[PDB]
């Protein structure tokens, strides 16, 4: 111990010297291996016949595959989409002004692929992998194809774990399990993104509290949006902290039409990494209705014959190829999961459109947001009569399965009586009860913008609204009473309902004793 040496004490300590030696020890036997097996492969060429509108018709390229990435001599990439007898139709990944007639097209040999892995977490990429946030290359990442076959029947198991969004209009009435795809459909400026941003921010609040295995890693695919709209979301995910778990795949409105068509598949491939390796993913395709317009543009410029409204025939297969990749895998495959939230924008509340009726037919649930409910104050503007969840009571919170069964049972009774009592004919002292109680529940399911409520403070609030504790409280401050119902009620009763997951008989008698020692406004 004492009196080491002089030659032992002359060493500089935290120099690299051995990380350098580790790199040179792992590198030189690997690069002699590369040079001893190195054939420079034959590159098949092609001439550009014509070019325009982001399509280049290419002569030659006779061994090119369908869906294969090709490279122009301008540096701009492409994808061979329709192989014809005389030419190749190549959609161009970028500006087609740099491609000329007679330019050389080289085939890369490879189908379109994106870098997947945990090195994509935190980063903002474009429609194919390449990061656009100005933070260098994607370290710790691995390429894989964007068009992967979805897991079949034997590769799944039933959707049973709950996905908490933190939006109590969703987590009570239309609950969402892990592996379930749920459509957020609505009109132009409803709360569609705000439902999906709240589902992502809430996973940050749950990831700090759950063990490492059941953490949900979110991917937000932004198709056809503004570039400053998605810069407002990277700023929001940074100052909340959700960007630690979030990948953003950003194919904005100035990107080429094949980059916006392919960005939901790139984001699904970045999120299928967590599904395939036993973790849990959450993919949000913001405006699939803007991906199909990008698909219609290529299909009409590749001269594929138009169908309904102008859309190609295979536009159902466009979205069902993509949404069926959201699955809850079997325990042999890891038990991993991927939960999808496609967003579809309708025009005037017209869900009978082409792309709208396709994705309604694909996804399990539906979160239908209404612009007339938005302006009545009800925000999230969820149409509780039209919003479904096909998983339903299978994968919701057991503490709110026994409370929100009563909640939708009463709100179904609220709806038809208010259609009659707005004429002002007569009222019946129990018909008076259901349109006075359903107003307590409608104000209960309102929420602010970026504050997801965990799951236990949601079920205590619907408990206090359905077990009568919020009767004789005025309707204007039920949105203001329920902060007192969460703050003044003891913070250790939220731990028991989080740990049990259920209202035990030894807890309802304690909680309804605690919902009486609260000072409610108005009263």
């Amino acid at each position: 111990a004492d009196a080491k040496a002089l030659d032992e004490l002359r060493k500089p300590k935290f120099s690299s010297k051995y990380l350098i030696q580790h790199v040179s020890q792992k590198l030189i036997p690997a690069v002699k291996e590369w040079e001893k097996s190195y054939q420079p492969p034959v590159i098949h060429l092609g001439r550009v016949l014509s070019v325009g509108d982001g399509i280049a018709r290419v002569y030659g390229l006779k061994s090119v595959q369908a869906g294969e990435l090709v490279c122009f001599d301008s540096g701009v990439k492409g994808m061979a989409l329709n192989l014809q007898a005389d030419h190749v139709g190549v959609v161009v990944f970028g500006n087609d002004s740099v491609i000329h007639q007679g330019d050389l097209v080289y085939r890369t040999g490879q189908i379109v692929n994106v870098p997947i892995g945990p090195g994509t977490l935190g980063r903002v990429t474009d429609g194919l992998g390449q990061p656009i946030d100005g933070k260098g290359p994607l370290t710790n990442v691995r390429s894989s194809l964007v068009e992967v076959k979805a897991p079949g029947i034997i590769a799944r198991q039933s959707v049973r774990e709950p996905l908490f969004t933190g939006v109590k209009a969703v987590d009570a009435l239309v609950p969402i399990g892990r592996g379930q795809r749920e459509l957020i459909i609505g009109d132009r400026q409803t709360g569609k993104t705000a439902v999906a941003i709240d589902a992502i921010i809430h996973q940050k609040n749950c990831n700090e509290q759950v063990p490492k295995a059941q953490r949900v890693y979110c991917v937000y695919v932004a198709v056809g949006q503004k570039r400053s709209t998605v810069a407002q979301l990277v700023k929001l995910f940074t100052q909340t902290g959700a960007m630690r778990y979030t990948i953003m795949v950003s194919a904005t409105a100035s990107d080429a039409a094949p980059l916006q068509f392919l960005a939901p598949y790139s984001g699904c491939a970045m999120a299928e990494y967590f599904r395939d390796t036993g973790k849990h993913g959450l993919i949000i395709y913001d405006d699939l209705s803007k991906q199909s317009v990008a698909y219609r543009q290529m299909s009409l410029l590749l001269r594929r014959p138009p169908g309904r409204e102008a859309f190609p025939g295979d536009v159902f297969y466009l979205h069902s190829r993509l949404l069926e990749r959201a699955a809850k895998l079997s325990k042999e495959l890891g038990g991993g999961s991927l939960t999808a939230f496609p967003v579809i924008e309708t025009q005037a509340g017209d869900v009978s459109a082409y792309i709208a009726t396709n994705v309604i037919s694909i996804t399990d649930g539906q979160i239908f947001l209404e612009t007339e409910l938005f302006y009545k104050g009800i925000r999230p503007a969820l149409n509780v009569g039209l919003s479904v969840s096909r998983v339903g009571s299978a994968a919701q919170f057991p503490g709110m399965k026994q409370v929100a069964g009563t909640l939708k049972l009463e709100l179904a009774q609220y709806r038809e009586v208010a259609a009659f009592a707005q004429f002002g004919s007569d009222l019946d002292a129990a018909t008076q009860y259901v349109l006075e109680r359903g107003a307590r529940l409608t104000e209960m399911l309102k929420q602010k913008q970026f504050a997801p409520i965990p799951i236990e403070r949601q079920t205590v609030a619907v408990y206090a609204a359905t077990k009568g504790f919020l009767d004789k409280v005025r309707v204007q401050d039920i949105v203001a009473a329920e902060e007192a119902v969460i703050s003044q009620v003891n913070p250790a009763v939220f731990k028991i309902l989080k740990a049990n997951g259920k209202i035990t008989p030894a807890l309802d008698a304690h909680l309804k004793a605690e919902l009486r020692k609260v000072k409610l406004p108005g009263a």
């Binding site: 080491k4 040496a5 002089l6 500089p12 120099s15 010297k17 350098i20 030189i28 002699k32």
Partner: protein, 290 residues
């Protein structure tokens, strides 16, 4: 253990852990062990990659063993620092900096036909304040000729550029003609000696100015970090430094089986020995078994 390309680079090394590995290898050799064969293999790219990753293992304990002359008076500590970096480069297998960066220029420009691709492909090694000043002069002679200035030397379409590029070089502050006369040489040694003695004054000016710019940037970074650090309260400082130290320990403790991880934790334990040994006798320093 060393792999005999490890130890041939460490024969002229003078840092501690290279010299003890050399001495252990020679004490292995004296006790009846044969040398292994030298690899006459690994064609030129692998040989360059190996000397690149073997110069760094001589440079990296040598850079850490050179005291920076921060906050010093006079150019003689800057000349000490630059001469120590010169000696470390010579021990690691580099040449003179002039010869080495000229070799880098000639390696990056073996394909060069025009002066435009010369000034665009050696951009990573020439400063922007000189590359832009040569680009505007190339454009000035290109506006004269209305034909691309080519990299020939005997073509006077190049020489109309080069006579103004020498003016740019003398307006930067560096004497170009004594540099050209040094690397062109002469016949008689008495007339080449008087220009080598001027080139070496330029060279000492240049490497002292480079080492001084590096030292002033390190001083500015240290003063910026300190003035950002003296704005915090003390408990914030303690929990920040303790959190960073704990994370950097756990990143080397989750590495198990890597040589750098065992060396990292062994150096942490040696630092703790240094602290205990100056706690045992603070007037005498650490205990050195001499």
């Amino acid at each position: 253990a060393v792999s005999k390309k490890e130890v041939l680079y460490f024969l002229s090394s003078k840092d501690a852990e290279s010299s003890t590995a050399v001495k252990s290898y020679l004490k292995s050799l004296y006790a009846g062990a044969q040398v292994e064969a030298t690899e006459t293999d690994a064609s030129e790219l692998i040989a360059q990659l190996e000397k690149k990753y073997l110069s760094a293992q001589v440079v990296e304990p040598g850079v850490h063993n050179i005291a920076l002359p921060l906050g010093e008076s006079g150019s003689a500590p800057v000349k000490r620092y630059a001469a120590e970096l010169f000696n470390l480069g010579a021990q690691a297998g580099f040449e003179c900096p002039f010869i080495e960066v000229s070799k880098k220029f000639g390696q990056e420009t073996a394909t060069s036909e025009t002066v435009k691709d010369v000034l665009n492909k050696t951009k990573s090694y020439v400063s922007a304040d000189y590359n832009a000043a040569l680009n505007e002069v190339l454009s000035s002679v290109e506006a004269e000729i209305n034909g691309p200035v080519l990299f020939d030397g005997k073509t006077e379409g190049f020489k109309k550029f080069a006579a103004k590029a020498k003016a740019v070089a003398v307006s930067r502050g560096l004497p170009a003609d004594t540099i050209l006369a040094y690397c062109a040489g002469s016949a008689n040694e008495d007339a080449a000696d008087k220009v080598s003695k001027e080139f070496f004054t330029w060279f000492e000016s240049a490497y002292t100015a480079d080492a001084a710019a590096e030292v002033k940037a390190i001083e500015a970074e240290a003063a910026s970090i300190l003035d950002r650090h003296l704005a915090k309260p003390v408990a914030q400082i303690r929990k920040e430094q303790a959190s960073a130290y704990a994370s950097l320990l756990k990143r080397a403790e989750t590495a198990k089986g890597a040589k750098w991880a065992e060396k990292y934790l062994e150096d942490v334990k040696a630092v703790q020995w240094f602290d205990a040994s100056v706690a045992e006798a603070p007037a005498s320093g650490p205990k050195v078994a001499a």
